[PDB]
Design an enzyme around this catalytic site. Structure first.
Site, PDB file in Angstrom:
ATOM      1  N   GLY D  59       0.825  -1.191   0.000  1.00 49.33           N
ATOM      2  CA  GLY D  59       0.000   0.000   0.000  1.00 49.33           C
ATOM      3  C   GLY D  59       0.866   1.249   0.000  1.00 49.33           C
ATOM      4  O   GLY D  59       2.025   1.213  -0.410  1.00 49.33           O
ATOM      5  N   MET D  89       4.949  -3.068   3.338  1.00 46.45           N
ATOM      6  CA  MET D  89       4.327  -2.077   4.209  1.00 46.45           C
ATOM      7  C   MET D  89       3.626  -2.735   5.388  1.00 46.45           C
ATOM      8  O   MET D  89       3.609  -2.175   6.491  1.00 46.45           O
ATOM      9  CB  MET D  89       3.338  -1.223   3.415  1.00 46.45           C
ATOM     10  CG  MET D  89       2.849   0.015   4.157  1.00 46.45           C
ATOM     11  SD  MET D  89       4.180   1.157   4.583  1.00 46.45           S
ATOM     12  CE  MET D  89       4.594   0.620   6.242  1.00 46.45           C
ATOM     13  N   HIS D 113      10.992  -6.199   1.276  1.00 48.03           N
ATOM     14  CA  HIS D 113      11.661  -5.583   0.132  1.00 48.03           C
ATOM     15  C   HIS D 113      11.289  -4.112  -0.016  1.00 48.03           C
ATOM     16  O   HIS D 113      12.160  -3.252  -0.181  1.00 48.03           O
ATOM     17  CB  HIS D 113      11.312  -6.354  -1.144  1.00 48.03           C
ATOM     18  CG  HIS D 113      11.930  -5.782  -2.382  1.00 48.03           C
ATOM     19  ND1 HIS D 113      11.182  -5.264  -3.417  1.00 48.03           N
ATOM     20  CD2 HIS D 113      13.226  -5.644  -2.751  1.00 48.03           C
ATOM     21  CE1 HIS D 113      11.989  -4.835  -4.371  1.00 48.03           C
ATOM     22  NE2 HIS D 113      13.235  -5.053  -3.991  1.00 48.03           N
ATOM     23  N   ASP D 151      14.430  -8.766  -3.341  1.00 46.88           N
ATOM     24  CA  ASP D 151      13.001  -8.994  -3.555  1.00 46.88           C
ATOM     25  C   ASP D 151      12.726 -10.475  -3.338  1.00 46.88           C
ATOM     26  O   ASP D 151      12.879 -11.299  -4.242  1.00 46.88           O
ATOM     27  CB  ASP D 151      12.585  -8.537  -4.948  1.00 46.88           C
ATOM     28  CG  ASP D 151      11.082  -8.574  -5.148  1.00 46.88           C
ATOM     29  OD1 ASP D 151      10.360  -8.926  -4.191  1.00 46.88           O
ATOM     30  OD2 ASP D 151      10.622  -8.249  -6.263  1.00 46.88           O
TER      31      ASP D 151
END
Ligand SMILES: C[C@@H]1Cc2nc(NCc3ccc(Br)cc3)[nH]c(=O)c2CN1Cc1cccc(C#N)c1
Ligand SMILES: C[C@@H]1Cc2nc(NCc3ccc(Br)cc3)[nH]c(=O)c2CN1Cc1cccc(C#N)c1
Ligand SMILES: C[C@@H]1Cc2nc(NCc3ccc(Br)cc3)[nH]c(=O)c2CN1Cc1cccc(C#N)c1
Ligand SMILES: C[C@@H]1Cc2nc(NCc3ccc(Br)cc3)[nH]c(=O)c2CN1Cc1cccc(C#N)c1
Ligand SMILES: C[C@@H]1Cc2nc(NCc3ccc(Br)cc3)[nH]c(=O)c2CN1Cc1cccc(C#N)c1
Ligand SMILES: C[C@@H]1Cc2nc(NCc3ccc(Br)cc3)[nH]c(=O)c2CN1Cc1cccc(C#N)c1
Ligand SMILES: C[C@@H]1Cc2nc(NCc3ccc(Br)cc3)[nH]c(=O)c2CN1Cc1cccc(C#N)c1
Ligand SMILES: C[C@@H]1Cc2nc(NCc3ccc(Br)cc3)[nH]c(=O)c2CN1Cc1cccc(C#N)c1
Ligand SMILES: C[C@@H]1Cc2nc(NCc3ccc(Br)cc3)[nH]c(=O)c2CN1Cc1cccc(C#N)c1
Ligand SMILES: C[C@@H]1Cc2nc(NCc3ccc(Br)cc3)[nH]c(=O)c2CN1Cc1cccc(C#N)c1
Lengths: 174, 174, 174, 174, 174, 174, 174, 174, 174, 174
Positions: D59, D89, D113, D151
């Protein structure tokens, strides 16, 4: 937005705490709702404080100016809390609070760039916004213009030393 | 639009305060709603005043003319408060208030340019608007045409000295 | 669309004042609603008048004809009030009011042009409209056709002279 | 979303079990709702714990930081339960839980990440996130910057040894 | 979606029969709803069984894993009924039921292909699904991989002999 | 756009008659093409005149200013012919013509309103336009500001007496 | 874009005049075209200069950096010409011109704000831009950063005294 | 649009027969093309006539006025041929033909209603159209306005009686 | 895309300089074109080198692998020039160049993150990419996996140290 | 649409066989093209016949009337061949052929319903169509109206006996 408990909504009981939150972009409908809530809180009590949570990525200049005029019209002290970010209009409403009640949070970002059709009208809007800033933040017009010319965010301590904020609370002081 | 305090929302208690808000563009539905609210407030009491908050970026010509006709028909004194911006159609209603009850805010913006298929119809509507302005603003047709030919926003003091407004208040009478 | 006052909606109390509001374009749903409201008002009382506020930019020919047939069927006298603009079907329903009870505000606009797929069907509907106008406005078919050939808006006074209106009220006569 | 059992909705009773849930992407409205629920639970009781279920794919950074500031502001200990997945987040909110009360299910996925317009603003936000992770996870800034640069998704045990989680429950304590 | 009768919706009364229906694709909202319903049924009674009707054409891997973790966490025996079909995640939740309570219907189709962009993340999720199948279905990893590599549906008897199902009912055995 | 007769196109032989044309809105591509054509015509002959037909309803301010700077840079006398209409930017290009070579047809329309995100940038551009008009039309800054503030078109004779035009031809004078 | 004169196109003869035009936004295709044109002009002659007309509102950072690297790689002196406007990404190309050959027209606009998801990459690109500006304009990194931190357009004289331009021509040298 | 036979396009040879066809709506591009064709035919020979075939359902008032000014400017006599239909601007250009050479086919339709944001601009344009009609059709302004106030189509014989046409040919002169 | 001079397009002469520029994202059509150009240049001369300008933001894995297999199949030495950036597949083709011929400009950006429905297929493809990198860059599999796991851009000097590049030229060799 | 062989397109050679194919819906562009082709074939030879293949699902009434007027204007005998179908306007053009040359094919369908804004205009147009049919088909107005009122197709023999067609060929009679 579930019902919290006399069957009040999360945003209904919120206003019953003398709190008017401006979430999302400031538009005509949001501005009218905020003005109505401020006037209702004034009617309920003209001396008790009114809290305003400011989290907006921008909005309309006229909407923010109307909200500011309503805030200054009512005789209630406005405690502006920057819960999230404070865009141009959000940061203006944040600085438009009562001297000594403009709080914020540690990770709150403030921006006064005012990125902004009618050339002369928007320029005069910028002029009156500079005037409002010089009035509330106890600063000069030149420094306000120089700051709003830079497209950058400010930290709670930077906004507090510049005049936009007054206190930077991390936990309820007890 | 949360519920405020007998289980009334914002826009319901707003009308229970003899107050009508023409928010957003003026259309057929908004015009009918404003007319119904004005007539209902008349029914409640034809003597008490009716407050009209004007914040619109424009609207339809026929809608504004209908709102004006309803305002003039009812025997209630209309206090037109310019809360925000007053576009051409909204500026007309702002000027169509009772002499001595057309108020505005410090940062309010008033415009009367009227940036306006039937050419002859819209021309006759413009002439009717000129006549209404000359009637309420106590001005002439030539000056009204010259002013509405310019695309610009008037300030509260400018609109007060021109005849659109009567008072420019910053805080309630102390 | 707030709630007005036993927790009645604005449009609900509106229908409780024998008022039917033909607002916006006239479609099948709006036509059915108007017909139902007219018949319900007749059921409540067949002698008391029914007020029809007309503000529409046009609509469907069959819908307006259905509304007209319903108005003529019920024994109640229909006071057609032009509040705003009266388009082809709006102006037709306006002229279709009871003689001596068709009213219009000072700045309202009337237009019977009827800017007329089945060509023969719509032409026969146009002939029916010609006949209805000749009946209600007491004018001849020739002048009705000549006027409907012109695309223009009539003023309240002009529409009164043409037979579409009976009175042009500015304020409640007292 | 059916009604459960005094005519309480599922999400209503959920908030009535001190259980907040950051579901779906984190936006302004979702963050405002979460903050309101947290403050309401603090008002109901400032010492009782508050459960936060995290199944968010990410988000707005500002929204998550506002949620974090609210969580740290209230005195209630926050039990962060990773259900399904805890994206970047959300992972902060998962790592921002009270020490010894950050739980995760066996198949949940954790990721910090934080894929990363204003470059300076977002990079200052990234630095603030690094500082927050170093504070809560008891890790250094270098290792946090190295982990968030990759990632990939961490397993519950991996996130537990990394300092993001405190327990990995398969079944309630027997 | 009519109301069945103390004014309960069909789904509300369904959830009052200790039954949670995962209808349609499994998304974040549906996953959260199913988790909340399962936990509420646990709160009501941790001993009584919970019926789970599975009819979905697919869904999200993380959502299905969250639903599975919730099912395994609660101490209630889950009776998984395949009504109409069972996609990858649907068939997985079907196999995740209590041994001896994984029923189905005659014309119910079971598919475990899992037609699985972070490639490593989805592959690790695939391995987690392999492990879950090997645990519940009482099979080995190689056979599970070979089965999930083929894109095809299975009949109730094939799914019963493979380990996904336990019984194939046609009518209530009495 | 047919080919005319050594197999040249309409707009090809047009430019081969030293005739440049600004048709439709002025944009980056159109302005670049006009600049290239002007420079090519200068290369062909720096003393022969260049005809610029203007039938543009406006465009980008920077594009029109680029065209103006190119016209001023080239030593060729530019005959600006207002064909159809000359909007704000075109009007500048129409006013930027060589003194004594700005022609217009009887029914052509001229307008310098210049209706027009960066407020200060467009305001300084408008100031530059004011200066250019004061230079070419041999007028003052105040009168230019007053004229451009009114959103209205001008007739060929009005623009000729104001300074935008020099001659108003109906037929080739012989 | 008509054909000019051996039947050459506008943009064809433009490149045959050792002139390259970076018009409109800068993208991968436009940057590739500019690079190809620059290298072809170098192949034709490495001593003769190459003119680069810059009228662009911006574009991709990597594309502009590729154009800059191609300009610096070729041995031909690059005469940059700001026509209409030189936005941030174009401004670099305008500042990257050979010392003493960066020209701009009177009404041209220069801007270096560079308003700029790969946060870290865009910040490193901003640092590379700082370095390039410090190199070409003969200014320190601090002043370059403080300047481009503001969102504003520089005038030809301002950009000349700042180091972005060298000459400000109104007409060719007489 | 095939090729006709030195490899001419149908429209290419069409324009080589001194014939210009205003087909479809009249826009800025169509107006520019028609003006270019008319001026090219004038260049070829100023004595020989030019045939203008008119089949348009409408267009832009400014475009039609530009075409009219171009027709009046050139010394060539214009033979207007109404083919299929002639809308407001189509019929205006039709009547604008040279006296004694305005033709039309037996089934062609003529309409001068002119069914038509700047109110004053379009009104002055309509006044100019009234003047042009009074000039060419030898009719008075009053009858012209009363005629085009009606929305109807005139037949070739009626348009000839009204002065819009000079001849109604069924076959070439035998 | 102008024509350069025997009437050759820019991209045509580009391929006649033994150059094959992979501009923009890599797709099936772009891959086929690149393969065709490489094989045509091989046919022209198998000894002369082939220059490959690489400016791509990404592409398809299969397309890049096909281009790589074509580069390896042909006996021509491939000089890969990174101009502007080298994305996941662009950087792979860059590293796939002949040893001692992989060049890059000073401001170019290299990235091998490879952010990549068939999961097993794409993972096997990424393993093949690991193997290709280990072969060409002389690096090990573990270090390649660690580098590609980080989402970041390498500078020309860094990519040269990592083995992706052999030279970083600022100007042609003196 | 390949090229047939002096490098002529299929339609170019078709038009070179004195053949004009009205394919697809008949609009302004197709109507103008057909008119131009007919007039060109007339210019080539006014004695030789002109073949017209009619295969259209409808079209515009004014377009068909223009095509009919052009056909009747030229002195060439029109051989109308119905290939596949003949809609309202298509069938009208078919009947508009020379008596004794209106052929067709076995599976060709003819329809004259004319399912058809301007009510009076289209009504008068359909009356003109009635007249044209009565003229060419050698029938009365009543029968033509009764036939066109029915929404049905007709066979080649029915159309031949009704007057629309003259011959019904299957193979070239020899
Ligand atoms: C005097 C006029 C009427 C009035 N009415 C009441 N009633 C209380 C009330 C209002 C609203 C709700 Br919901 C519930 C209870 N209270 C007031 O403060 C005002 C002030 N008005 C002037 C004014 C000044 C500044 C901004 C605006 C605006 N917008 C309007
Ligand atoms: C006489 C006609 C009927 C009537 N009915 C009542 N009842 C009170 C009432 C109205 C509305 C609501 Br909601 C609730 C209670 N009160 C009136 O003022 C009118 C006046 N009408 C004429 C008229 C004049 C001007 C504008 C319009 C309009 N549009 C209509
Ligand atoms: C006889 C038939 C039934 C009937 N029923 C009642 N009941 C009262 C009532 C109606 C509606 C509401 Br809501 C509430 C109470 N009253 C009547 O006036 C009619 C007349 N009908 C014939 C008729 C005539 C003209 C137009 C239409 C139409 N559309 C239908
Ligand atoms: C002091 C200011 C007012 C206030 N009011 C109450 N009342 C209880 C209550 C709140 C909400 C609902 Br719903 C129901 C009951 N309780 C508080 O904790 C606060 C704190 N505020 C400061 C503050 C600090 C951090 C984040 C935010 C935010 N956003 C705001
Ligand atoms: C301990 C924590 C709080 C808690 N609270 C109650 N209260 C009963 C209740 C829950 C929900 C509704 Br609606 C109504 C009544 N009951 C519990 O089982 C849990 C377990 N939680 C941990 C946990 C475990 C597995 C998956 C998730 C998830 N997502 C969360
Ligand atoms: C000096 C520089 C190079 C140059 N080159 C030639 N060659 C002739 C030519 C140009 C174009 C075509 Br197509 C065909 C033949 N002629 C010139 O006027 C200029 C002037 N340039 C400066 C300049 C001044 C004002 C606006 C712009 C812009 N945009 C650029
Ligand atoms: C050495 C390598 C190959 C080469 N080839 C020729 N041939 C001339 C030519 C090029 C293009 C056209 Br169209 C017509 C004729 N000329 C050169 O300057 C280069 C330079 N290359 C390195 C290089 C440097 C900087 C940016 C890029 C890029 N993108 C590439
Ligand atoms: C004098 C100025 C230049 C000029 N140039 C020529 N050249 C012939 C020619 C033109 C075009 C093509 Br293609 C081929 C050959 N012939 C002229 O008539 C005009 C008239 N001009 C004034 C003018 C008057 C009315 C409308 C417009 C417009 N739009 C412009
Ligand atoms: C043997 C097969 C046919 C062949 N034909 C020629 N002719 C020259 C030529 C090719 C193309 C153009 Br355009 C112009 C001239 N030259 C070759 O290199 C190949 C190789 N082919 C095998 C092969 C290997 C690797 C990748 C691909 C692929 N894709 C294909
Ligand atoms: C008299 C006027 C000029 C004229 N010119 C020539 N030239 C031959 C020709 C035309 C076109 C191409 Br392509 C190639 C060679 N031939 C003619 O038939 C006509 C007749 N015109 C009147 C007229 C009558 C009926 C319909 C329309 C229509 N639309 C126009």
């Amino acid at each position: 937005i579930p019902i919290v408990v006399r069957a009040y909504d999360i945003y209904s009981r919120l206003l019953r705490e003398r709190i008017v939150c401006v979430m999302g972009p400031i538009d005509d409908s949001v501005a009218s709702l905020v003005i109505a809530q401020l006037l209702f809180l004034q009617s309920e009590s003209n001396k008790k404080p009114i809290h305003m949570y400011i989290n907006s990525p921008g909005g309309v200049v006229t909407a923010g100016l109307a909200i500011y005029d309503t805030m200054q019209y009512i005789l209630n002290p406005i405690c502006t809390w920057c819960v999230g970010q404070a865009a141009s209009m959000g940061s203006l409403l944040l600085a438009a609070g009562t001297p000594g009640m403009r709080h914020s949070l540690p990770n709150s970002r403030i921006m006064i760039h005012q990125p902004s059709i009618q050339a002369e009208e928007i320029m005069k809007l910028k002029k009156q916004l500079y005037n409002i800033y010089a009035k509330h933040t106890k600063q000069s017009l030149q420094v306000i213009e120089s700051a709003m010319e830079r497209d950058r965010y400010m930290s709670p301590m930077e906004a507090q030393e510049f005049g936009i904020l007054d206190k930077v609370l991390v936990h309820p002081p007890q």
